[PDB]
Design a protein around this nucleic acid. Structure first.
Ligand SMILES: Nc1ccn([C@H]2CC[C@@H](COP(=O)(O)OP(=O)(O)OP(=O)(O)O)O2)c(=O)n1
Ligand SMILES: [Mg+2]
Ligand SMILES: [Mg+2]
Ligand SMILES: [Mg+2]
Lengths: 698, 106
DNA sequence: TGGATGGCACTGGCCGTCGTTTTCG
DNA sequence: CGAAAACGACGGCCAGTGCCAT
């Protein structure tokens, strides 16, 4: 086994030069450094480890180092380099599995200070190395006199870079050892730093293998990217911007601008007494200014000529209140609230900090006498929605148009194990939060994401999209877990017609989507009021629905009961939270990992969300593997390409319809496989849609 | 009272087309300095009667005029002399500083 | 006692860098 | 010429609110 890391001139997409690398060999207990000209020797060594059926350990190597080495080996040495999956270990992947309850800085992309809770020490250091190095470089660049530009720190190799390169490895080695010492994932009778690759995977908790496969597959997906119709979203931005302009025109006309105190340093004091009056806006007593300026002539100095008048403005001693002129901003809930109250609106919902709630829900119900202002409300709601679309599609810091790459695709990031439950997280941008096809402008947004927007590299023909989603996943997960209580009744009934549509009819809801929001809100202990809000009624309609549905599957209580007994010893209830005494603070996931439980009231959700997340994770894995054992190639230069994974859904680009039909059928076989793999008490299924884009495929 | 209480709609002809000097006071009820210079203005209205006109404009009740003058602080005293701003001083000057402000501009 | 798990926009307060303007020593 | 002073466009940080999706 060996621990390694490299230093190059840029992130994966733009990297074109290997600066250096380091390898620690457990078989020799020694570090070896490689410089620019040692590149070939570096690759040899790594390949030597593979030849011995060994293991290579990288921290974030799966997403960066490995694919990068492949890219540089070709560009720089015109050599084919491809470390097999089974030979690679990633401590960032391991760290995220074992410390799932914790956050990390996604290798320096996020700010530690903005992250809640603690951060594992070794990983924190690794994620800050690029920044600490920049500081150390930007410093030596001042001691010598030169100035600093962009990110020159990475343009050329230097021994300062080499030193960090070495420390990364010594630090990655410690992290590796710390992680391996956890007896829950690695049996203690085995030295995992002295075993062949097949042994490392087979002797460790199934979870270790799954996570490394997911990460390997997902890094590939990132590289693939999601074919994006830049032009279309570009024209939509033009449409939305015009509409925002018109509403702003009407709104600023309906609600006039106004002034406000601003910049007041000193405090206003009573003239009579001297009593400071905090209530009054802060003031500013200038000490520079007068009627005329100081004399400039012999005449002025003598009074024979009026001194130059002072065009200053202020007059030393004369206190004034500085103010700013503000123009009505529809995006400011503070403004909306101010204007609406001045029109007779009386809020009936405030926040923890006493601020009157101003969301669409309350706006929807606001009523004022003035017809014009009353109508302005409908314009404010539109403006907010329009803005939301612009924010996400063009203007925000993570807007689609700011992330489309040269290859006409958006390479969103994925943290395969970013959520406690085992779900993944998505960002830059979050391709898992794209407006639903049925929401305002949903179709246009969704349609801009699609295989059709990618043209085959050889024929120039548009690719086809294959969309697959697990059917009623978490509800089938519930059925599995309560099977020991209802002997599989629910697991059987859930299969009589679509479950959500059926529930929709029973609850008399308007859409299937609304049945999904209801049932899950219900299953996870939403109060009567919230249930009302979800279905558009009140607390009574909520209590009704709770009984009506809990009455049907009373076993849900039994399950809830057992989860409580297994986790909690006893619990109280103070003034700012619940004080709990735990028997065990975690749940054993389907692949054996520990799944931290944050709260007793969320235990069931932790159980079912985790089961769904791990089922789906094993699923996308088995699916790609079946496609591959079928002779299909993963890549735009092949037959299919994973474009996105949205929890229990996958969107795959295909070279031809035929391939898309096979992908769809295969995903289905895969789902059933997984269900059999963990002896699930509820049959698992998936629904597949062939089409041009995301709007048609989900 | 001999002070003109303006409105956005009346401002133009009461001020910009008045013939003779006119001192406009852009104020707000929530400003301490404003409530201070007020009394002085009432007096300055009689003392300079015939020499100029003293008018007040409440920027809350009349938000459209002030913006045209980039008012950044209050109370603002804009001295008009035929549609044009003659002199401009901001702050709750004293009865003395004000008279010295006018005289030098009248 | 509670829907859950996440990303992320946008305002507004705090704070400090920084290029521009004015009357004065 | 620089210093003291009144400024505002400006970016990094952060808390509070609320919308995106599964
Ligand atoms: N408001 C929601 C919506 C969904 N989910 C969870 C549980 C199901 C999982 C995936 O969402 P869907 O794909 O909508 O789940 P589904 O019930 O399998 O939907 P379908 O059968 O329609 O595919 O996410 C949730 O916790 N809260
Ligand atoms: Mg690295
Ligand atoms: Mg689903
Ligand atoms: Mg889904």
């Amino acid at each position: 086994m060996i621990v390694s890391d490299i230093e190059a001139n840029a992130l994966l997409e733009s990297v074109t030069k290997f600066h250096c690398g380091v390898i620690y060999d457990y078989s020799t207990a020694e570090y070896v450094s490689y410089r620019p000209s040692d590149f070939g020797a570096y690759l040899d060594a790594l390949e030597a480890e593979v030849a011995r059926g060994g293991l290579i350990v990288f921290h974030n190597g799966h997403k960066y180092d490995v694919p990068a080495l492949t890219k540089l080996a070709k560009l720089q040495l015109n050599r084919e380099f491809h470390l097999p999956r089974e030979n690679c270990i990633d401590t960032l992947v391991l760290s995220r599995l074992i410390h799932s309850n914790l956050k990390d800085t996604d290798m320096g992309l996020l700010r530690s200070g903005k992250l809640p809770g603690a951060l594992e020490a070794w990983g924190y250091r690794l994620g800050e190395m690029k920044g600490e190095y920049k500081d150390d470089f930007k410093r030596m660049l001042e001691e010598q006199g030169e100035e600093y530009v962009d990110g020159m720190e990475w343009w050329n190799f230097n021994e300062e870079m080499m030193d960090y390169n070495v420390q990364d490895v010594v630090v990655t080695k410690a992290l590796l050892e710390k992680l391996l010492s956890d007896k829950h994932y690695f049996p203690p009778e085995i030295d995992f730093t002295d075993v062949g690759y097949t042994t490392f995977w087979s002797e460790s908790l199934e979870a270790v293998d799954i996570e490394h496969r997911a990460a390997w597959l997902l890094a590939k997906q990132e590289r693939n990217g999601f074919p994006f119709d830049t032009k279309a979203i570009e024209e939509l931005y033009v449409e939305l911007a015009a509409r925002r302009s018109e509403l702003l025109r009407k709104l600023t006309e309906t609600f006039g601008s106004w002034y406000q105190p601003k910049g007041g340093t000193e405090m206003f004091c009573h003239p009579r007494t001297g009593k400071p009056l905090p209530k009054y806006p802060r003031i500013k007593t200038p000490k520079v200014g007068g009627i005329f300026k100081k004399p400039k002539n012999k005449a002025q100095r003598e009074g024979r000529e009026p001194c130059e008048l002072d065009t200053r403005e202020y007059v030393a001693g004369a206190p004034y209140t500085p103010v700013e002129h503000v123009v009505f901003n529809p995006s400011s809930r503070d403004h909306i609230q101010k204007k609406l109250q001045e029109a007779g609106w009386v809020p009936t919902k405030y926040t923890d900090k006493g601020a009157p709630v101003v969301d669409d829900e309350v706006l929807e119900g606001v009523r004022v006498d003035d017809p014009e202002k009353q109508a302005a409300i409908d314009l404010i709601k539109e403006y907010l929605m329009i803005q939301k679309r612009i924010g996400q599609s063009a203007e925000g810091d993570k807007a689609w148009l700011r992330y489309v790459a040269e290859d006409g695709k958006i390479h969103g990031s994925v943290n395969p194990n970013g959520a406690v439950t085992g779900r993944a997280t998505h960002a830059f941008p979050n391709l898992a939060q794209i407006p639903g096809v049925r929401s305002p402008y949903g179709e246009q947004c969704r349609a801009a994401f699609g295989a059709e927007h990618h043209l085959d590299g050889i024929t120039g023909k548009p690719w086809v999209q294959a969309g697959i989603d697990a059917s009623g996943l978490e509800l089938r997960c519930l059925a599995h877990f309560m099977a020991r209580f209802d002997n599989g009744e629910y697991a059987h009934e859930i299969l009589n017609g679509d479950i959500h549509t059926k529930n929709q009819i029973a609850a008399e809801l308007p859409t299937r989507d609304n049945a999904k929001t209801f049932i899950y809100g219900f299953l996870y202990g939403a109060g009567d009021e919230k249930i009302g809000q979800i279905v558009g009624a009140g607390k009574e309609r909520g209590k009704e629905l709770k009984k009506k549905f809990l009455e049907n599957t009373p076993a849900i209580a039994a399950l809830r009961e057992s989860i409580q007994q297994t986790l909690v010893e006893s619990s109280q209830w103070v003034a700012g939270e619940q004080q709990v005494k735990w028997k065990r603070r975690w749940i054993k996931g389907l692949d054996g990992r520990k799944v931290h439980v944050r709260s007793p009231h969320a235990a069931l959700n932790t159980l079912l969300q985790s089961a769904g997340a791990l089922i789906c994770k094993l699923w996308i894995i088995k699916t790609e593997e079946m496609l591959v054992e079928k002779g299909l190639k993963h890549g735009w230069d092949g037959d299919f390409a994973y474009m996105a994974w949205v929890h229990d859904e996958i969107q795959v680009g295909c070279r031809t319809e035929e391939i898309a039909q096979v992908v769809i059928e295969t995903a289905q076989e895969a789902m059933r496989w997984v269900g059999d793999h963990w002896n699930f008490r509820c049959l698992l299924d998936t629904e597949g849609k062939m089409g041009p884009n995301w709007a048609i495929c989900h | 009272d001999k002070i003109i209480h303006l409105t956005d709609d009346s401002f133009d002809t009461d001020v910009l087309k008045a013939d003779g000097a006119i001192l406009v006071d852009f104020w707000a009820e929530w400003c301490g300095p404003c409530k201070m210079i007020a009394p002085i203005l009432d007096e300055i209205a009689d003392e300079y009667q015939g020499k100029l006109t003293v008018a007040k404009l409440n920027i809350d009740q009349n938000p459209g005029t002030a913006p045209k003058y980039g008012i950044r602080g209050i109370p603002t005293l804009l001295l008009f002399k035929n549609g044009e701003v003659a002199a401009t001083k901001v702050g709750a000057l004293s009865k003395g500083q004000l008279k010295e402000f006018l005289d030098a501009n009248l």
